[PDB]
Amino acid sequence: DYKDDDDKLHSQANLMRLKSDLFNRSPMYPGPTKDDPLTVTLGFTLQDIVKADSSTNEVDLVYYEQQRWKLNSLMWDPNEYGNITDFRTSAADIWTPDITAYSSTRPVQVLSPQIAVVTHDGSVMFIPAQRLSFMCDPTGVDSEEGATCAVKFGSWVYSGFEIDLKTDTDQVDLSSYYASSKYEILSATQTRQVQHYSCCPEPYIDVNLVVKFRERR
Amino acid sequence: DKLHSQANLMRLKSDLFNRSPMYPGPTKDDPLTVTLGFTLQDIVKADSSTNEVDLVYYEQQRWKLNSLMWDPNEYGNITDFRTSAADIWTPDITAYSSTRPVQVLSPQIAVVTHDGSVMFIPAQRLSFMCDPTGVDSEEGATCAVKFGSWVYSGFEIDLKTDTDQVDLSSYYASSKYEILSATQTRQVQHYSCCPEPYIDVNLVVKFRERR
Amino acid sequence: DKLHSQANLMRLKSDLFNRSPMYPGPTKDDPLTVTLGFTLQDIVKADSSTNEVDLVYYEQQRWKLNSLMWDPNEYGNITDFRTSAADIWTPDITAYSSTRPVQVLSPQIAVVTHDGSVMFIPAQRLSFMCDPTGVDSEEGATCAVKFGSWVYSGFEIDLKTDTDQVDLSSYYASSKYEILSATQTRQVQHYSCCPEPYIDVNLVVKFRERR
Amino acid sequence: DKLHSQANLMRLKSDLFNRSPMYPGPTKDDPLTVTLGFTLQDIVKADSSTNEVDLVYYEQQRWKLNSLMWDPNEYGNITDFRTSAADIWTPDITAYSSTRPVQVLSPQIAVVTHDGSVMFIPAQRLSFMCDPTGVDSEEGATCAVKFGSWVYSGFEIDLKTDTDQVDLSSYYASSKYEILSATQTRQVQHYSCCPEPYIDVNLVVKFRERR
Amino acid sequence: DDDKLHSQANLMRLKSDLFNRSPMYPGPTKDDPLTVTLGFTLQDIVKADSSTNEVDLVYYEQQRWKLNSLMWDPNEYGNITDFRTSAADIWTPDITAYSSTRPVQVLSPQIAVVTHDGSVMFIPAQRLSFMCDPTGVDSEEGATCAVKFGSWVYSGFEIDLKTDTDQVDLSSYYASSKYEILSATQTRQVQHYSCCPEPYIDVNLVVKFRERR
Numbered sequence A: 001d002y003k004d005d006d007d008k009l010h011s012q013a014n015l016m017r018l019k020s021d022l023f024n025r026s027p028m029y030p031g032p033t034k035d036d037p038l039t040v041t042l043g044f045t046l047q048d049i050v051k052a053d054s055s056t057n058e059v060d061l062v063y064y065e066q067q068r069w070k071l072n073s074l075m076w077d078p079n080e081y082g083n084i085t086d087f088r089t090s091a092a093d094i095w096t097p098d099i100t101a102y103s104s105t106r107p108v109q110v111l112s113p114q115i116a117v118v119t120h121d122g123s124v125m126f127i128p129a130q131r132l133s134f135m136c137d138p139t140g141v142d143s144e145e146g147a148t149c150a151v152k153f154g155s156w157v158y159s160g161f162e163i164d165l166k167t168d169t170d171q172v173d174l175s176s177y178y179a180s181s182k183y184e185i186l187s188a189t190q191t192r193q194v195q196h197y198s199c200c201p202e203p204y205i206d207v208n209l210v211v212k213f214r215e216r217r
Numbered sequence B, C, D: 001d002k003l004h005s006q007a008n009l010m011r012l013k014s015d016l017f018n019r020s021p022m023y024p025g026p027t028k029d030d031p032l033t034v035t036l037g038f039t040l041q042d043i044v045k046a047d048s049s050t051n052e053v054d055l056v057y058y059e060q061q062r063w064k065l066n067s068l069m070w071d072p073n074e075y076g077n078i079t080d081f082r083t084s085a086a087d088i089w090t091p092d093i094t095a096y097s098s099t100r101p102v103q104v105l106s107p108q109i110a111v112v113t114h115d116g117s118v119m120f121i122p123a124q125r126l127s128f129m130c131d132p133t134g135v136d137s138e139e140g141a142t143c144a145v146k147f148g149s150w151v152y153s154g155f156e157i158d159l160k161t162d163t164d165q166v167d168l169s170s171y172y173a174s175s176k177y178e179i180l181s182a183t184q185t186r187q188v189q190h191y192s193c194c195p196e197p198y199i200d201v202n203l204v205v206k207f208r209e210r211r
Numbered sequence E: 001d002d003d004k005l006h007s008q009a010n011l012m013r014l015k016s017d018l019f020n021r022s023p024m025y026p027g028p029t030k031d032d033p034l035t036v037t038l039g040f041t042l043q044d045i046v047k048a049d050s051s052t053n054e055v056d057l058v059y060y061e062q063q064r065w066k067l068n069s070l071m072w073d074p075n076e077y078g079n080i081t082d083f084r085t086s087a088a089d090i091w092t093p094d095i096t097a098y099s100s101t102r103p104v105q106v107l108s109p110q111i112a113v114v115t116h117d118g119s120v121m122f123i124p125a126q127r128l129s130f131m132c133d134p135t136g137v138d139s140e141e142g143a144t145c146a147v148k149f150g151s152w153v154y155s156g157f158e159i160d161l162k163t164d165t166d167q168v169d170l171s172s173y174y175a176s177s178k179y180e181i182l183s184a185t186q187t188r189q190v191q192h193y194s195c196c197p198e199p200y201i202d203v204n205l206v207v208k209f210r211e212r213r
């Protein structure tokens, strides 16, 4: 078991060394630039429509927001570090995209630890669970066809020149939706949109989350 | 080339942010102008039991510092960059009649351009003093809130708007409240006692329930 | 030259904050007088099910430290500056009958003058203990709340007001509550807990539902 | 020998922390088993308008690390100590179906024992998804919530319970809700995407309006 | 005035000698146990929620303890007998309500008073929601509720508690509160658990109150 004990100690030293090599010894990645655009993949896992407030036209959602991207500055050779193929790290240690809901009515509440997973190909996976209030008229929610609301997500400060967005699919993952929610989901889609606004020449990109729902009976 | 671009940005940031480090803010001898513009998104609620109304808007702030200027050719034709608002000086623009601390809805990041201008656009939810009486009539109700520096007079920070028309192109079409008009107007207030003039931007909103 | 004003400002602040260790707070040997003045902006809410009332006001704080003074001639004739409240010592002025933590409505920035004078004016929303019984009568209701240091007795911190009249000139004219009177009065208190006198400023507000 | 008791404790912590390499968290090579146990104190509220229920409980977490071991003999027979949760690694245990961020009710301090085991017990108020339909009947309502690592799969973190019976010995005897049963059960599952198994502890509560 | 400058320099020298010169106190231990004195000053019962059985109290919680590592001879420091310091600069006890339902909200500055004998006084003002059935509050007999306070992580072998009296101080109780106080006591308690070997100490705050008439 001495050998086993030693192998454990070595794997610890190797993880600490990989983290030293990527961070502490190398620059904090400054973010994407026009010559060097970054694509961030987004996908939503809708867990619950908690509340629909017809007195203020706000609706509260809980969901997991999957964010994926990939950087060269986060790559490593797993054979240089004892076959370490990935690691968990505090979101504070790396750059993360400023993905923002554009029509929230209260600051998002974070429901999960701010830790991401980094893989040897340099891909990052960060999945914040969130409670969000957003502008939404729930009239029709007490009808067969229910209510329809939409909310757009995207970078706040990086245009389409610097950050692009994609989805893997336009279907929101509903396999974890709360079976006894006050509201049943009729459909939920997530769709990339590209936009040009009157002012600027930068194209603007978002993912539009559209939810159709009604009072469960 | 990727590493080169990345290197250029990091070199610029280094030159700017610590070589002659944190900017001490404006003074009478080195004053500054902040341009303000509002993009009104939603009147979320009106409480006539307390005379508070809740607004959601984007507040566009713009200013310019010589200490933020650079030549793009010296840094790989980098014309701009994004940085955390805590890495730079920011103006203390404040609503003068809020009743609750402002809630911030957008990342605290700004865009700096090679000519030394900064654009910082905090999205905000604000509760402020407002009597909604009449909001359910044809005339609607009218409320106003002033914005400006808390600690700097007009001798250190001037305020400006590009237009006195609030941007309503993003106003929530299914809001409980419709906008009849919204203006943003520079005001100057002088006082006999103190020789410094005080500057604000008055946001005036006229609004009504739907019909 | 604009450059040189900046260098001068940064150097003054480095001399005052770095080229000397901070002010340790007042002592019995070196007591401190703080002047307080209230600018009452709004009575927002009066909850008769809980006997709490919510106020919005500006609280003016003034004091003076020999350790903050300088000769304007050594520093390009800079006579004053703005600085973050965290850079200097600030008095721990506390509402004695609050029922919730004070909510801060203004930026935490103070103004320091070359004579050692500091002016700090936090805007605050406060819930405090108050029976609003009679608020819906001509006579109105009456409430009070004391402000003073939490940890310094009158031997270390003394309080003053410039007047006994709360500044009502910015009071919100469409508030649900009209102010009948508002006074601020220094009091010398003896508490059974402690052999040292404690000083407060007592804010008394008389108000009623509006006509 | 009390100054010596003190000096020994300081050395131990200095030895373990500000010296020896600290744990970088568990890996597929060096996995960690975390024991969870719940002490249910109160069901505060059941909201049938939103299907949320608020619980107050103590969450017992226990794990063991070689890098936290020591021989009490080298340290004045110190067998355990208390230290801030921020000095050591702690597991990211998370309710999978909360609807608000958890509110912590107890200080963030852990107990570490010479065998390298750590005991951390945060008291929490949790809102989670729960349909309380039937709570006003004899059969009562049943709700469940899963707890597990957010970012570590079963390959890095395994979970266990010491018992499948929730500790009810501190349940508030005058709660609006009576507990009919509460269990805590380890579960394993996979998702068609991934080969790594996922481990949680499922907290199942049956409760009804008290009579 | 040079005298004032000199006192200030002594106070700074003391604080630096006490802290940044002596490695922060690691907390009490089996061999170095500590006694914490607790007293409550009840200011208000703000709210009694009968739909959730939560009651909200506003009170000052007095805490006192003494450490050898904080003592000094005034004669070596310009006869300073005491000073005020941020509560972050020193160890403070982890005194906790055992049946709160919301995190405590702090109403006073986090600053304590240390005196040359090594003793410390820290008095945080707090609003607390805790588990309490206010049934009977609108009657002559009133309602009775209780809430324990004690260390969360130290047992009786490391932290003992004491009260100077078993009567809660009511002299600052708000005279126009919705609720009047029939009685309020604060009593040291020793408990043992089956889970654990060591005995546990708390102070039990019992309050009897009713709707004011």
Ligand SMILES: Nc1nc(Cl)cc(N(Cc2cccnc2)Cc2cccnc2)n1
Binding pocket: A102, A154, A155, A156, A157, A199, A204, B039, B058, B060, B109, B110, B111, B119, B120, B121
């Ligand atoms: N000129 C402009 N106006 C507005 Cl009112 C918002 C906006 N932003 C945020 C922003 C923040 C800092 C610097 N540049 C841009 C981008 C945006 C906002 C909303 C939806 N899509 C993009 N840009």
Ligand SMILES: Nc1nc(Cl)cc(N(Cc2cccnc2)Cc2cccnc2)n1
Binding pocket: B096, B148, B149, B150, B151, B198, C039, C058, C060, C109, C110, C111, C119, C120, C121
């Ligand atoms: N003498 C004085 N009195 C007051 Cl009641 C406020 C004040 N202000 C705040 C203010 C308020 C409204 C509009 N513009 C500015 C300026 C200020 C703030 C902080 C420190 N010094 C001056 N200065």
Ligand SMILES: Nc1nc(Cl)cc(N(Cc2cccnc2)Cc2cccnc2)n1
Binding pocket: C096, C149, C150, C151, C191, C193, C194, C198, E041, E060, E062, E111, E112, E113, E121, E122, E123
């Ligand atoms: N002995 C003692 N007991 C109490 Cl119940 C409060 C107290 N205070 C706070 C106070 C001061 C004036 C008016 N209301 C409250 C002074 C103090 C002393 C030492 C540490 N912190 C506060 N000191």
Ligand SMILES: Nc1nc(Cl)cc(N(Cc2cccnc2)Cc2cccnc2)n1
Binding pocket: D039, D058, D060, D109, D110, D111, D119, D120, D121, E098, E152, E153, E195, E196, E200
């Ligand atoms: N074994 C154990 N289990 C529990 Cl359910 C709680 C606990 N306590 C003590 C305690 C004392 C009085 C009231 N509630 C809790 C807190 C604790 C925290 C961290 C390590 N050890 C004990 N210790």
Ligand SMILES: Nc1nc(Cl)cc(N(Cc2cccnc2)Cc2cccnc2)n1
Binding pocket: A045, A064, A066, A115, A116, A117, A125, A126, A127, D096, D148, D149, D150, D151, D198
């Ligand atoms: N692919 C993926 N997608 C989602 Cl929608 C969540 C997720 N989780 C969270 C989770 C949720 C429920 C039960 N166990 C774990 C794991 C995770 C979180 C952060 C980074 N990488 C993986 N991983």
